[PDB]
Design an enzyme around this catalytic site. Structure first.
Site, mmCIF file in Angstrom:
data_model
loop_
_atom_site.group_PDB
_atom_site.id
_atom_site.type_symbol
_atom_site.label_atom_id
_atom_site.label_comp_id
_atom_site.label_asym_id
_atom_site.label_seq_id
_atom_site.Cartn_x
_atom_site.Cartn_y
_atom_site.Cartn_z
ATOM 1 N N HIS A 16 110.578 28.660 57.953
ATOM 2 C CA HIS A 16 111.213 27.495 58.564
ATOM 3 C C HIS A 16 112.351 26.836 57.788
ATOM 4 O O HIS A 16 112.835 25.756 58.226
ATOM 5 C CB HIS A 16 110.125 26.449 58.848
ATOM 6 N N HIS A 128 103.123 23.419 56.860
ATOM 7 C CA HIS A 128 103.180 23.710 58.290
ATOM 8 C C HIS A 128 104.222 22.844 58.961
ATOM 9 O O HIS A 128 104.343 21.652 58.647
ATOM 10 C CB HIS A 128 101.850 23.466 59.027
#
Length: 133
Positions: A16, A128
């Site tokens: 990410h 996350h």
């Protein structure tokens, strides 16, 4: 899913933060080869790992994706991002085709205490991507 040679925070960076190319089909091969499958969707934040760590210091909030987790942090500012959408799958990971959608949005990330392999400079690290608002 997560390859064992990486910490949770290093895997967050792979998936990410670090886009190896400005196009999703190219960029995604790194993740898919480690996953041994073509991921259906994936968001890359166009920000640095150190910036996300500063977000990890913002006040704790409930994770939108799971109301029982409390290790989440709102970005406070918007960042550009690119969302990758799988448009043609293949049994050959290198043939998987992606389309992309850019945006400028807030984000909510989940963070945990650092692993010994992460640099000591970061006691708390992102693990996350919970929600793109």
């Amino acid at each position: 899913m997560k390859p064992p040679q990486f910490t949770w925070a290093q895997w967050f960076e792979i998936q990410h933060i670090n886009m190896t190319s400005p196009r999703c089909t190219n960029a995604m091969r790194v993740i898919n080869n480690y996953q041994r499958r073509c991921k259906n969707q994936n968001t890359f934040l166009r920000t640095t790992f150190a910036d996300v760590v500063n977000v990890c210091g913002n006040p704790n909030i409930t994770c939108p994706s799971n109301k029982t987790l409390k290790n989440c942090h709102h970005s406070g500012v918007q960042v550009p991002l690119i969302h990758c959408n799988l448009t043609t799958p293949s049994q050959n990971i290198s043939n998987c085709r992606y389309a992309q959608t850019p945006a400028n949005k807030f984000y909510v990330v989940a963070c945990d205490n650092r692993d010994p392999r992460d640099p000591p400079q970061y006691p708390v690290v992102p693990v996350h991507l919970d929600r793109i608002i």
